[PDB]
Amino acid sequence: GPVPSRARVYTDVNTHRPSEYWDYESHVVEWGNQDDYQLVRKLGRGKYSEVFEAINITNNEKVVVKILKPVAAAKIKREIKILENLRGGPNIITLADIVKDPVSRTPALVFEHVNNTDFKQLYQTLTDYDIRFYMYEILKALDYCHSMGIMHRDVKPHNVMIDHEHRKLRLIDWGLAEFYHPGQEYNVRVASRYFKGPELLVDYQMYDYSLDMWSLGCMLASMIFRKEPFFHGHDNYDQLVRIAKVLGTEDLYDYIDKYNIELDPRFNDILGRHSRKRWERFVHSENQHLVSPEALDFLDKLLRYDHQSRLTAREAMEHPYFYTVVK
Ligand SMILES: CCc1ccccc1-c1c(Cl)cc(CNCCc2nc3ccccc3[nH]2)cc1Cl
Numbered sequence: 075g076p077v078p079s080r081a082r083v084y085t086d087v088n089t090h091r092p093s094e095y096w097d098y099e100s101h102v103v104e105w106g107n108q109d110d111y112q113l114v115r116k117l118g119r120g121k122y123s124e125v126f127e128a129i130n131i132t133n134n135e136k137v138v139v140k141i142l143k144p145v146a147a148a149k150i151k152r153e154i155k156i157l158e159n160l161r162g163g164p165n166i167i168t169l170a171d172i173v174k175d176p177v178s179r180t181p182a183l184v185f186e187h188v189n190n191t192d193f194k195q196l197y198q199t200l201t202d203y204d205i206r207f208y209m210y211e212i213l214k215a216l217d218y219c220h221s222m223g224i225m226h227r228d229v230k231p232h233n234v235m236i237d238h239e240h241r242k243l244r245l246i247d248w249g250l251a252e253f254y255h256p257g258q259e260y261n262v263r264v265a266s267r268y269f270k271g272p273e274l275l276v277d278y279q280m281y282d283y284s285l286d287m288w289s290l291g292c293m294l295a296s297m298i299f300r301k302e303p304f305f306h307g308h309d310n311y312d313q314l315v316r317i318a319k320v321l322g323t324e325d326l327y328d329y330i331d332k333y334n335i336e337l338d339p340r341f342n343d344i345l346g347r348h349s350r351k352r353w354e355r356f357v358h359s360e361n362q363h364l365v366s367p368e369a370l371d372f373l374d375k376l377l378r379y380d381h382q383s384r385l386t387a388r389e390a391m392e393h394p395y396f397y398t399v400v401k
Contacts, residue, residue, distance in 0.1 A: 075334065076278065076279075076334055076335055077333045077334045078257060079278075079281075079282070079333065079381070080256040081254065081283050082386070083220065083283065085256045087221065087222065087223035088223045088255055095159065096155075096255075098154070099151060103181070106173045106184070107173065108173040108175065108176055110130055110171070110173075111129065111171075111173065111182075112128060112131060113126045113139065114127045114128055115127045121143075121145070122143055122146035122249055124141045124143070125138060125139070126139045136189075137170060137185060137186070138184070139182050139185075141175045141182045142178075142181050144178070147181070149249075152251070153248050153249045154181070154183070156224055156251045157183070160219055160224065165212070165215035165243050166215055167186065167235070167244040167246045167248075168185060168186040170185060172184070186244075188235040188244050189239070189240075190236065197297070200238075202363060202366070203399075205297055205364060206396055206398060206399050207241070207399050208234075210391065212245065213290075213390050215243075215244075216229070216245070216287075219245075220254075220283040220286070220387055223254050224252070224254065225285060226245065227250045227285060227286070228249070228250040228265050228269075229245075229290055231293060231296075234246070234293075250264050254282055261279075262274045262278070262281075265289060268292060268304070268307065269289040270310070271381065272314065272329065272379045272381075273381050275313055275314040276314070276329075276330055277335070278333060283386070284382065285381065287376050287385060287390070288381070288384065291384075292377075294372070294376070299356045299357075299361050299365070300361040301356065311338070311344065312344070315341075318346075318348050321350055321351075323348050324349075324350070325350060325379055326379055328379075353373065353374065368395040371393075372385075372395040375393070
């Protein structure tokens with residue numbers, strides 16, 4: 075069977091802290107008043123929630139309200155516990171209140187408002203310096219949640235709010251977040267297809283905090299190479315083939331062999347044999363302004379098949395790519 079794995083960092087955080095910290099099912103939710111909030115407009119609807127711009131009447135301040143769908147209403151305690159544990163942490167969205175929505179009869183989470191800069195504008199106009207600055211801000215959020223025994227499991231551009239005017243970044247949508255317990259087998263159906271780590275794609279359940287690091291590398295590659303998404307799989311199987319066309323198949327087989335993972339036999343007809351490509355292959359006149367040897371070295375240390383061989387968020391903060399960032 076599969077060889078077990080554990081994180082090389084923050085393995086003992088959950089054991090060290092009291093059970094109340096991670097036993098979310100035991101947590102009693104203290105409800106606020108739904109009447110304090112007036113919904114202004116629907117911002118979006120996903121598979122588990124609907125998000126709205128709203129106003130807190132008591133202080134006349136804008137807030138964001140997430141109304142959970144019944145299909146998500148079960149594992150709401152997990153998100154609530156995670157949000158309360160991380161509250162006040164660097165660049166973590168602040169959960170301001172929890173109320174019962176009178177219409178859906180489900181919990182509605184109230185968050186601090188972030189005046190988001192248009193997402194196309196940011197992708198199109200952020201400079202090399204701004205990319206390093208914001209990547210450093212995401213690393214502060216990731217090292218914080220990992221040091222708190224939590225893995226986000228859904229890192230992607232959509233889950234990162236940026237108010238560029240105020241150089242303000244928040245990591246949002248902790249609905250897929252889970253506490254990391256060494257030796258636990260987790261569901262591999264997490265994150266979004268283009269951001270899924272090879273561990274998920276090969277069905278390796280004993281993953282840790284390092285999955286967030288792969289997703290972060292996918293974001294960086296997309297941004298610096300002007301290729302959205304960087305690994306553009308047609309489905310979850312083709313997603314691994316797209317990664318293997320860049321990282322090569324020999325290192326993929328070395329990874330699955332290390333953990334005694336057996337690939338799904340459907341890969342026999344589609345994976346092929348591919349050499350590892352040099353990152354310089356993806357550089358062109360339209361992205362040269364965002365690429366540097368330091369960017370490529372940093373990306374190379376995140377986009378590794380072996381989850382245990384990726385940079386951790388705290389080590390990544392001291393990488394030369396961030397030396398230019400004002401600290
Ligand atoms: C390509 C990802 C990336 C790589 C390197 C540096 C920055 C980014 C980035 C960009 Cl360009 C744009 C955004 C903006 N994302 C907005 C997401 C969002 N806006 C919302 C507004 C309302 C509700 C949810 C929302 N989620 C986030 C990041 Cl990390």
